[PDB]
Amino acid sequence: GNGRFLTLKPLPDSIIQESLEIQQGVNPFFIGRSEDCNCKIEDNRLSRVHCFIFKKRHAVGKSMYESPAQGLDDIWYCHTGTNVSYLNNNRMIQGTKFLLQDGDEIKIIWDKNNKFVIGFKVEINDTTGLFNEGLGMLQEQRVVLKQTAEEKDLVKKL
Numbered sequence: 001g002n003g004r005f006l007t008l009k010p011l012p013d014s015i016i017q018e019s020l021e022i023q024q025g026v027n028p029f030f031i032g033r034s035e036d037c038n039c040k041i042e043d044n045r046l047s048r049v050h051c052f053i054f055k056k057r058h059a060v061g062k063s064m065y066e067s068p069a070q071g072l073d074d075i076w077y078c079h080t081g082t083n084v085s086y087l088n089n090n091r092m093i094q095g096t097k098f099l100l101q102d103g104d105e106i107k108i109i110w111d112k113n114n115k116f117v118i119g120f121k122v123e124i125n126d127t128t129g130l131f132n133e134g135l136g137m138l139q140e141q142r143v144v145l146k147q148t149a150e151e152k153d154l155v156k157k158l
Helices: 149-156
Strands: 006-010 020-022 029-032 051-057 073-079 096-099 120-123 144-146
Antiparallel strands (some): 006 020, 006 120, 029 051, 051 073
8 A cells, every 4th residue: 555554434334335545544534424524424414524533642651661552643533513423332422532443333323214324434454553453452442532622623624
């Protein structure tokens, strides 16, 4: 690859059926109804910036002895459109940050009335000095974080 690391693959089961490629963690990645977002999701009720994937350096403590995880870069999926974000079994709200482990198929919008369900498959082919292969294996186990002024600023400029 010329610079691939994370492939975001939305599929046919979800209203979004395309494949995106996050180059060595190209952040932030904007996602929503308008293709303007680095990621494409055609969902009427879904906001243009409704969801965005951001990358940050994994916050770790002093490297006691010789151990990996010596501070690296992690990717955080930050939802934003009122439809609330959904990953595995963690429910989110309109503006939450969540870790994306490999094989992360998240539904940004799910409506039984119109079957308007979304789903993206996170597949990290390359791990560029990442805190982990990308399967998320830190102390926290799939926890939802809140978006602060820092995240809100990312969506300010698509």
